Design a protein around this ligand. Structure first.
Ligand SMILES: O=C(Nc1cccc2ncccc12)c1cccnc1
Length: 340
């Protein structure tokens, strides 16, 4: 690897470790913000658009209910998410601006990316051309190069987690499954269509699962549907473990070749997990037109700029029932979340 990349990653790791070892805590509070709109909702949390009452800045505030986090066995995952997010710094990762907790909830206040999920744009257009898919894929390759060099595995790559920013570039959001791992880890997590075989088979797995997921993502971007599609998860898992994938005839030969090497069932043969590491991907013919430095510097013109009216526009997100942010008069689960 060019000494340039080595020295870049060495500095990246130094800076990450300093923040990792001494995490920020308690850097805002709820009544500093006005609530605008619910942008997403799940079994233990929500994402709200909020506005800071003094600066006027908009943020995406992730609110996690401590009691539900405990019930659904997400304690360590939520602590991972916040400790990692406060320590990382890369152009294609959504930035954590503040975090805090109260009697009921955990809060992560992120930059608000108004362009919407890649998922929405992909489903609206059907499929992306290979250059369009390649632009996004290159950002993910660089992001994983960064994360993996810090001993971080992301574990939730899917189109819904990739937001399109005001310049048409990707921002990765949702670090709920991200973890600092030297060696192997074992937790079953991830959306079914994106799970690597070794996750399905309950093995001790490593960063190779992220490279598998990149193969799934690239396939889905270029085809409009994922490679192991079936109606129910068990049928998806059978397809994943089988070692068989069918490519549309419109795929280029270079794309098919890259995908066979990312969607390699044998993790010891999978691109991104060999002796040359990420360079087997970066140097593949499918990426021959990619100027990696120019992508990193955000100097490439993007495939499209999302349509939105301003930093507070929510048009590219969808509509959810608006529920209270209630804060109990009694502290819940204080011990479990001491470090947050
Ligand atoms: O933090 C999250 N998302 C976001 C971060 C930053 C900006 C966003 N803009 C708009 C919408 C969501 C955004 C997230 C979403 C789903 C699950 N876990 C986390």
């Amino acid at each position: 690897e060019q000494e340039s990349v080595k020295e870049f990653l060495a500095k990246a790791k130094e800076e990450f470790l300093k923040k990792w070892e001494s995490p920020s805590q308690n850097t805002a509070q709820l009544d500093h913000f006005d609530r605008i709109k619910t942008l997403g909702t799940g079994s233990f949390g929500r994402v709200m658009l909020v506005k800071h009452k003094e600066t006027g800045n908009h943020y995406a505030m992730k609110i996690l209910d401590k009691q539900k986090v405990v019930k659904l066995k997400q304690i360590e995952h939520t602590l991972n998410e916040k400790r990692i997010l406060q320590a990382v710094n890369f152009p294609f990762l959504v930035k954590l601006e503040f975090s805090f907790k109260d009697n009921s909830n955990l809060y992560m206040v992120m930059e608000y990316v108004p362009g919407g999920e890649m998922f929405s744009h992909l489903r609206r257009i059907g499929r992306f051309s290979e250059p369009h898919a390649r632009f996004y894929a290159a950002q993910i390759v660089l992001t994983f190069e960064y994360l993996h060099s810090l001993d971080l595995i992301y574990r939730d790559l899917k189109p819904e987690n990739l937001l399109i920013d005001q310049q048409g570039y990707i921002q990765v959001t949702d670090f709920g499954f991200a973890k600092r791992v030297k060696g192997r880890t074992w937790t079953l997590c991830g959306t079914p269509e994106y799970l690597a075989p070794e996750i399905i088979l309950s093995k001790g797995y490593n960063k190779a699962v992220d490279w598998w997921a990149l193969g799934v993502l690239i396939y889905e971007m270029a085809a409009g549907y994922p490679p192991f599609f079936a109606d129910q998860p068990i049928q998806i898992y059978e397809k994943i473990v089988s070692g068989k994938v069918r490519f549309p005839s419109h795929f280029s030969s270079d794309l098919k070749d890259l995908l066979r090497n990312l969607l390699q069932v044998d993790l010891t043969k999978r691109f991104g997990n060999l002796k040359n590491g990420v360079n087997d991907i970066k140097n593949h013919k499918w990426f021959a037109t990619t100027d990696w430095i120019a992508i990193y510097q955000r100097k490439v013109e993007a495939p499209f700029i999302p349509k939105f009216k301003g930093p507070g526009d929510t048009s590219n997100f969808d509509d959810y029932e608006e529920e209270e942010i209630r804060v109990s008069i009694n502290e819940k689960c204080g011990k479990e979340f001491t470090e947050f």
